[PDB]
A paper describes a structure:
To address this question, we used cryo-EM to investigate the interactions between PKA-C and dephosphorylated CFTR. The sample, comprising 30 µM recombinant human CFTR purified in digitonin, 250 µM PKA-C purified from bovine heart (bPKA-C), and 2 mM AMP-PNP—known to bind and stabilize PKA-C but not support phosphorylation—is very heterogenous. Three distinct CFTR/PKA-C complexes were observed including two 1:1 complexes with a PKA-C molecule bound at different locations (termed site I and site II, respectively) and a 1:2 complex with both sites occupied. Despite rigorous data processing, the final resolutions were somewhat limited: 3.8 Å for the PKAI-bound complex, 9.7 Å for the PKAII-bound complex, and 6.0 Å for the 1:2 complex. The conformation of CFTR in all three complexes is similar and closely resembles that of the dephosphorylated CFTR in the absence of PKA. The two PKA-C binding sites are spatially separated, appearing nearly orthogonal to each other when viewed from the cytosolic side of the membrane. Despite their distinct positions on CFTR, both PKA-C molecules are oriented with their N-terminal ends projecting toward the membrane. The presence of two distinct PKA-C binding sites on CFTR provides a plausible explanation for how the eleven widely dispersed PKA sites can all be phosphorylated. Mapping these positions onto the 1:2 complex structure indicates that nearly all phosphorylation sites are in proximity to one of the two PKA-C molecules. The results revealed a comparable distribution of the three CFTR/PKA-C complexes, suggesting that PKA-C binds to the two sites independently and with similar affinities.
Author numbering:
A (entry chain G): 13 to 351
B (entry chain A): 3 to 108, 118 to 402, 437 to 645, 844 to 886, 910 to 1121, 1125 to 1173, 1207 to 1436
C (entry chain K): 13 to 332, 341 to 351
The structure:
């Protein structure tokens, strides 16, 4: 405690203040480039660009205005736009500004070419015994810091975390989150990280956050997630079943916390009852987990990226294109007053 | 899915689940597939999950691996739930006699009788379900007990795997195979028996308040004496065990050399030695049986004093009503039955459980093998600074091997001289101590020793894979496996059994190569795959797949063949564990051309058991007459007394049925002595019969059955059968005497008792068939689990290579569940039998009680008290009848084994020779004829290598043979075989040597002089061969005469034959068994001393037999004759 | 005691006068034969010779002075020479003469017709129990006599024990033996005879000889060493553990005394506690082992060698500027 609790209080003292002062229309789409496009995204476009004024390489998100309204995911981005605006934590990459246009919006975030570990682990299969811990510690720290902010992440997928030049992983895509206090029935995303209560369709809580990280860790250790089925219905049935077998090569000491993480009993979820993060902070499998020292990021990376320049997208598998010119009318422009 | 899941509460209480199962079983023969489906909660995969979760949680929790403290969290709630009802029922049974402390006053007692009858129903209800519940808990725990260690079996470190005793794990598994499961019935008895004493002492002080500990001290002293007798019994057993093992070793030696013993005609000496050795063991066993009989009889005898001493103080001090006397008798009966039986058995159960828990907890904690962190991504693998010990001794001398991704590497040197260890270390089987190895990790290996599990061709090829048509066809066609597959009967789905005898060793190697070829991986760690095939086949396999298909990928084949070594991408030759030279093919071939060139249960069975020794009948008559006279005297005493205080005290003599009908110490010892004597007589008869059996039936049975015929059966007959039979007889006599006493009380008892006995007999007969069928099925099925375990032990390295352990786990769980189904079914059937027997007994007791109530105070009290005790005796009697039924199987086997049929000048002439191994088998001779020259040897030539051992055995008629053998005018019929065969001289390839001193080992008949023996040995070249032995001639031939070499043993056999003075001597395989100097000395001795015999030296090589004068050429189904080499070498060999 | 102690005192008294006047260069290699090489031994050469002047067959222990200097064993050789030249006990074959040539040195020893008992034990495997006790009694006698002179043998191998025409064993190979009172830090020799104290690289006293004799008895009865391993490091670790399983044929009386002989505690080692050899003498394994009557060696031997003349090598095997002369100044 001591410095840790006071640091959480210092972060909390400023979090709501910027949550109380949203910005709007910080930039226009006239000072960027079209070098490449790292990926498409759920229902939008994204391009790798270079700052015309400064030169700093940065990303440029995009999505159709009608896409927000038609699928009923309009204000879902409205909350996330503010949520990203104030965040201050070493693990994640910040953003500079955003565009406000009559056809689509744009997000000016960092462009770390380190790419998703999903592809590196598809090329690698399974992470080594300490290799997974090296990332999972940052996952624990992120979970603590975010849960302190009175928000539900609802966002933990291998397609949600990227890598930096120094080797630090970083998350993005705040669309799925909700800064919720109390019970709620909202649910979305992919069932690969489905919780039993989420399938059960009841008032959710911050409990499922640990389950998602545990699913992520177990799948990172073996590549194959414990739940795998042809259709979400069969996958949801396996999730309701709650029976799974850990990897044969998996450590039994790691298996203890694995049983703890996926514990179906929502009341007895690991690190949910009274200790909060201390039970995870005391987990045996994280014996070599220097929380504050990894917070200084002095720990050597288990696998560093082979960077070849700021404009290099070698870790990316994209070279494609996309274009648009101009429109005259936004889809529900009255809905877009805080974006 | 399961029938027991579709069960009502009342149906569950009645345990009627097996009712249709019993209906089928008593009707028709048992069918293994007909077993009901295993319970859902009984799933091994389900239970082991919780067991493992708890074990891991505990292993992480604290610095003490208290496995018991974890399993308590798994079972204690149910254990206490069962124990609550168990203790309640124990309390009810204990207190029930106090309720009898009211009826003695005699109106109102009718309600008391109805309540006492209902007490039996309540106690039976409390008792019966608890046994099944606790036993289900036991079997459930035992399943996971096997499972945890079975999973750990794929976790152990190999460095300790070579050091961990292979038999230690097997013994650990077998020890708790049945003990630990049944060891739960006594579990809560600790929590109850002290409370039982607490209640009983209060009952006694309520009746007496002044004579309480008086009998308690006698009971404690009796327990102390009983416990003390156990140490002496264990000492006697331990002393007997060593001599029994020695006798078993001698018997096994006789079994191995049975044919040579029949040839030498040493059956009488072997039998005499066996009996003489067994005499001391029989004396020790008789002493141990006497001790055990005294200990067992103490429990029955105690009952008289137990009440007598307790009553004597109070009775002398003041008068007491006989009502309290009967009540105290019952209370003391309960107190003794608990004190002498319950406490020690529970203590033993708990101690054994604790020791087993400690052993299991220690075993699982061993250091585990650490898997390599690989398969991520890599280019060509490379090694650097390889150095480590295979257990100091560096198996690698700073070796380094950069293998290109796609290359074909190879290494040569001495076989297994660390190159195999280097391959294992690269594969991750051995942790390198120096340097750093880097590899892709996805790689297969092919151990020199093939590990073929049972299964069809598709199973052996897949080992957890789908059916790939092109890949399987290529593997078959390329590994010389397509032709061998076509050679199979089904040729595609020949399901292999155990042992792998269906295929040749080269076939096993082809299977290994194909299994390696089945999966694509970064490298193929081949280890001399061509090591069991012809050179042409090896070259064909290389050119087709080994050097064509996989060589495009990275490959590392351990090959010392020069021709392939020239084509290798790189070579690595190591000597003394150190690479002398290595590197590129051309560079290594040019750098050292000189090194390159240089290196390159019937009633008849029971009657036969009775009729073995006449003394048993006399002993039985004496015991029966004694029992009848005692019963008659007791009845006369009761009649006279019922129609000064010593007369009242004498009623206690009738009060305890156990002491009243106790087998007198002057009677019981003769029964056990007769049992031991009959067992000895049976052993002698079996030995004599085995000596005479025909070889044709002898070969039909496997030789290991001959060992099993005495290894355990005679032991069971000596130890188990007498004690069980005597206990059953004594209990039955006591019960029958109690029945007669009760019938003497009133003239109505028998009319109801007889239907009860008849129904009990019918129920026992019905239950017996199903019980035997279930027991046999369960015993038969247990073997497959050990078979799978042995297969895993053999294939451990290849399994670790494959990484497909989940399928093996599936197989192990399936086998365990299959055995568990039969075990649970048998246990449930036994529980139903116990419940039904209890119900019958309760009904009979209730009827007798009602009859008495409708009906004199002492008679009523006697009848009630005898009823109050008979239940435990009846239960023990049912258990003893079941035990006798189980034990009779060994006697039946022995009787079947004994019921066997017995076997039945120098010139000579043979004709009409017919022979075979069995009756009408392969015709070893087709009316063959031969003439024996006078004093001239005949060369066994011609079809040499087609089998001459059959003709040699036929020379002594040791096979199923018939024809004509007219030697010196004597025929094969007139002379007894023991006298006819003596003229022949055996020269077996393997020498039979009796383990013992040379005087006995060379002269089993013992009919010669020692000076003549020494003179002949000097003449036979044995005096110097014996001068190096301990002493002069007393040197015991330990380990089958392990000191003697093969040539020395041949010399000894020749000397023994010369001592026998046989008129003939057929030699066989001289140069094959003899070394150079040994063959020279043998030839000199034979040509010098044995020059005056018509010998037959059989040799596969014609050149060895070329020295012989006469020549008998062999051919398929026609043994021709060639008097001279002038035609023999030109026609028979050419 | 009485007569035996009176004799021990005289032996100890005469040993000092013998040690203070050692001989040197007793003879030259000019009155011997070269019939055959009895063996090599250690790092030397052994040959059977016949005295030209007398006729008595005598062994000759040749060894290179360069080998003594290069193997760093020169003072041990001088100590062995002096001790062999001063020894006086019936249990051992005495040394007759010494040779000192510019190439090598020879030592005259008596002809041993009985050969080494190790080969005989390999030929017979295991000796009878009384046969073991028959040799063990004289072994204990000679060891306690060495204790009566306060010397440490530092050498115990099966091949070093010969056998006499009378059947008594013949002692030789006095190389590692030295007369040092107290504790000595030197360590060498056979691992099978390496005590844990010597293995621990500490000061070693005479107490290890009891463990050596116990190992000798145990292996003579068993035919296999109680401590055995593939590598000497594993053999050293097994010896340090000090645990071994007794054979099935082992008698309780003999094995229980072997437990005291093989006790890891050097202070509790049998023959070192309080009485020297008296506790061993009273042991039931020596219940019939006449220590005093063996001084004449009149007991019927368990086995006698098949002697056929001193020139026969039947018992023996059939095989085939001085370096630092200043160091060898008393040879
Ligand atoms: N900070 C970043 N720097 C560079 N590329 C990025 C960054 N964040 C995302 N990307 C890339 O943009 C691609 C797709 O855009 P993305 O942000 O994931 O849209 P999305 O709809 O939210 N994805 P998802 O919700 O998981 O289906 C990803 O594959 C990333 O490679
Ligand atoms: Mg997306
Ligand atoms: Mg995304």
């Amino acid at each position: 405690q001591e410095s840790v609790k006071e640091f959480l209080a210092k972060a909390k003292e400023d979090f709501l203040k910027k949550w109380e002062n949203p910005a709007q229309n910080t930039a226009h789409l006239d000072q960027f480039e079209r070098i490449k496009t790292l990926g498409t995204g759920s229902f939008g476009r994204v391009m790798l660009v270079k700052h015309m004024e400064t030169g700093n390489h940065y990303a440029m998100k995009i999505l159709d205005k009608q896409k927000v309204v038609k699928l009923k995911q309009i204000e879902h981005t409205l909350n996330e736009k503010r949520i990203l605006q104030a965040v201050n934590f070493p693990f994640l990459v910040k953003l500079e500004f955003s565009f406000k246009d009559n056809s689509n919006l744009y997000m000016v975030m960092e462009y770390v070419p380190g790419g998703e570990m999903f592809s590196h682990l598809r090329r690698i299969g399974r992470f080594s015994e300490p290799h997974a811990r090296f990332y999972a510690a940052q996952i624990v720290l992120t979970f603590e810091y975010l849960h302190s902010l009175d928000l539900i992440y609802r966002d933990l997928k291998p397609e949600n975390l990227l890598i930096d030049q120094q080797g630090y992983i970083q998350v993005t895509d705040f669309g799925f989150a909700k800064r919720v206090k109390g019970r709620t029935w909202t649910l979305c995303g992919t069932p690969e990280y489905l919780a039993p209560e989420i399938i059960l369709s009841k008032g959710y809580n911050k409990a499922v956050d640990w389950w998602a990280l545990g699913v992520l860790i177990y799948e990172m250790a073996a590549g194959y997630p414990p739940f795998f089925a042809d259709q979400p219905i069969q996958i949801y049935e396996k999730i309701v079943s709650g029976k799974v077998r850990f990897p044969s090569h998996f450590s039994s000491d790691l298996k203890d916390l694995l049983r703890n993480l996926l514990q179906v009993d929502l009341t007895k979820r690991f690190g949910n009852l009274k200790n909060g993060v201390n039970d995870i902070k005391n987990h045996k499998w994280f014996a070599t987990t220097d929380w504050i020292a990894i917070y200084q990021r002095k720990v050597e990376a288990p696998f560093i990226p082979k960077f070849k320049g700021p404009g290099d997208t070698s870790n990316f598998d994209d070279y494609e294109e996309e274009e648009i010119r101009v429109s005259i009318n936004e889809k529900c422009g009255k809905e877009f007053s805080e974006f | 899915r399961s029938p027991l899941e579709k069960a009502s509460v009342v149906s569950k209480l009645f345990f009627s689940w097996t009712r249709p199962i019993l209906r089928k079983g008593y009707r028709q023969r048992l069918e293994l597939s007909d077993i009901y489906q295993i319970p859902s909660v009984d799933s091994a995969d389900n239970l082991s999950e919780k067991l493992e979760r708890e074990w891991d949680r505990e292993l992480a929790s604290k610095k003490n691996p208290k496995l018991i403290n974890a399993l308590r969290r798994c079972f204690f709630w149910r254990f206490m739930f069962y124990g609550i009802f168990l203790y309640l029922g124990e309390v009810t049974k204990a207190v029930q006699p106090l309720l009898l402390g009211r009826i003695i006053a005699s109106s109102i007692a009718i309600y008391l009788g109805i309540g006492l009858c209902l007490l039996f129903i309540v106690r039976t209800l409390l008792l019966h379900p608890a046994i099944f519940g606790l036993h289900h808990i036991g079997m459930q725990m035992r399943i996971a007990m096997f499972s945890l260690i079975y999973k750990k079996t794929l976790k152990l470190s190999s460095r300790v795997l070579d050091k961990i005793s292979i038999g230690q794990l097997v013994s650990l598994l077998s020890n708790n195979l049945n003990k630990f499961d049944e060891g739960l019935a006594l579990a809560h008895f600790v929590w109850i028996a002290p409370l039982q004493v607490a209640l009983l002492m209060g009952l006694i002080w309520e009746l007496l308040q002044a004579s309480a500990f008086c009998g308690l001290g006698f009971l404690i002293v009796l327990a102390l004496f009983q416990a003390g007798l156990g140490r002496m019994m264990m000492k006697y057993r331990d002393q007997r065990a060593g001599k029994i093992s020695e006798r078993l070793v001698i018997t096994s030696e006789m079994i191995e050399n049975i044919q040579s013993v029949k040839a030498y005609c040493w059956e009488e000496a072997m039998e005499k030695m066996i009996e003489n050795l067994r005499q001391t063991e029989l004396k020790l066993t008789r002493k141990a049986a006497y001790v055990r009989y005294f200990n067992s009889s103490a429990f029955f005898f105690s009952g008289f004093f137990v009440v007598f001493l307790s009553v004597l103080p109070y009775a002398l001090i003041k008068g007491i009503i006989l009502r309290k006397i009967f009540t105290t008798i019952s209370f003391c009966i309960v107190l003794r039955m608990a004190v002498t039986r319950q406490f020690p058995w529970a203590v033993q159960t708990w101690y054994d459980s604790l020791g087993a828990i400690n052993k299991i907890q220690d075993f699982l904690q061993k250091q585990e093998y650490k898997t390599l962190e690989y398969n991520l991504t890599t280019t060509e693998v490379v090694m650097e600074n390889v150095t480590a010990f295979w257990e100091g001794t560096p198996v690698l001398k700073d070796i380094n091997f950069k293998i290109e991704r796609g290359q074909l590497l190879a290494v040569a040197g001495s076989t297994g001289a660390g190159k195999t260890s280097l391959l294992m270390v690269i594969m991750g089987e051995l942790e390198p101590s120096e340097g750093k190895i880097k590899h892709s990790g996805r790689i297969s290996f092919c151990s020199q020793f093939s590990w073929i599990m049972p299964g069809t061709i598709k199973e052996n090829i897949i080992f957890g894979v789908s059916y790939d048509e092109y890949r399987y066809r290529s593997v078959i066609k390329a590994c010389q496996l397509e032709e061998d597959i076509s050679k199979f009967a089904e040729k595609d789905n020949i399901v292999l059994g155990e042992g792998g005898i269906t295929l040749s060793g080269g076939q096993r190697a082809r299977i290994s190569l194909a299994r390696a070829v089945y999966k694509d991986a970064d490298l193929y760690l081949l280890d001399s795959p061509f090591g069991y095939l012809d050179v042409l086949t090896e070259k064909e396999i290389f050119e087709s797949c080994v050097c064509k298909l996989m060589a495009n990928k990275t490959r590392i084949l351990v090959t010392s063949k020069m021709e392939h070594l020239k084509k290798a991408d790189k070579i690595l030759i190591l000597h003394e564990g150190s690479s002398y030279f290595y590197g590129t093919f051309s560079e290594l071939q040019n750098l050292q051309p000189d090194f390159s060139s240089k290196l390159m249960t019937t009633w008849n069975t029971y009657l036969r058991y009775i009729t073995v020794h006449k003394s048993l009948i006399f002993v039985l008559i004496w015991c029966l007459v004694i029992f009848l006279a005692e019963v008659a005297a007791s009845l006369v005493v009761l009649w006279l007394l019922g129609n000064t205080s010593s007369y009242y005290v004498f009623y206690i003599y009738v009060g305890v049925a156990d002491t009243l009908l106790a087998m007198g110490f002057f009677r019981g010892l003769p029964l056990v002595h007769t049992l031991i004597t009959v067992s000895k007589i049976l052993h002698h008869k079996m030995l004599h019969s085995v000596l005479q059996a025909p070889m044709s039936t002898l070969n039909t049975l496997k030789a290991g059955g001959i060992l099993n015929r005495f290894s355990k059966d005679i032991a069971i007959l000596d130890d188990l059968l007498p004690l069980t039979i005597f206990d059953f007889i004594q209990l039955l006599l006591i019960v029958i005497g109690a029945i007669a006493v009760v019938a003497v009380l009133q003239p109505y008892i028998f009319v109801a008792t007889v239907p009860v006995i008849v129904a009990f007999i019918m129920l026992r007969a019905y239950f017996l068939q199903t019980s035997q069928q279930l027991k046999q099925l369960e015993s038969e099925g247990r073997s497959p689990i050990f078979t799978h375990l042995v297969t895993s032990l053999k294939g451990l390295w290849t399994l670790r290579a494959f990484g497909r352990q989940p399928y093996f786990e599936t197989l192990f769980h399936k086998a365990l569940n299959l055995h568990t189904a039969n075990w649970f079914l048998y246990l449930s059937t036994l529980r139903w039998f116990q419940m039904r027997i209890e119900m019958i007994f309760v009904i009979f007791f209730i009827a007798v009680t009602f009859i008495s109530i409708l009906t004199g105070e002492g008679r009523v009290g006697i009848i009630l008290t005898l009823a109050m005790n008979i239940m435990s005796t009846l239960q023990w009697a049912v258990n003893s009848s079941i035990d006798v039924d189980s034990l009779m199987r060994s006697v039946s086997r022995v009787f079947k084994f004994i019921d066997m049929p017995t076997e039945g000048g120098g010139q000579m002439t043979v004709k009409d020779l017919t022979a075979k191994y069995t009756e009408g088998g392969n015709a070893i001779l087709e009316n063959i004829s031969f003439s024996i020259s006078p004093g001239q040897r005949v060369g066994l030539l011609g079809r040499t290598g087609s089998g001459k051992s059959t003709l040699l055995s036929a020379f002594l008629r040791l096979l199923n043979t018939e024809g004509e053998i007219q030697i010196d005018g004597v025929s094969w019929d007139s002379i007894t075989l023991q006298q006819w065969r003596k003229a022949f001289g055996v020269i077996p390839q393997k020498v039979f040597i009796f383990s013992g001193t040379f005087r006995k080992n060379l002269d089993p008949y013992e009919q010669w002089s020692d000076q003549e023996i020494w003179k002949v040995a000097d003449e036979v070249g044995l005096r110097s061969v014996i001068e190096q032995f301990p002493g002069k001639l007393d040197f015991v031939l330990v380990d089958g005469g392990c000191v003697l070499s093969h040539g020395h043993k041949q010399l000894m056999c020749l000397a023994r034959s010369v001592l026998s003075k046989a008129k003939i001597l057929l030699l066989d395989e001289p140069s094959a068994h003899l070394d150079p100097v040994t063959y020279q000395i043998i030839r000199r001795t034979l040509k010098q001393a044995f020059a005056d015999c018509t010998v037959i030296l059989c040799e596969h090589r014609i050149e060895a037999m070329l020295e012989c004068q006469q020549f008998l050429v062999i051919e398929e189904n026609k043994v021709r004759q060639y008097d001279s080499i002038q035609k023999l070498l030109n026609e028979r060999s050419l």
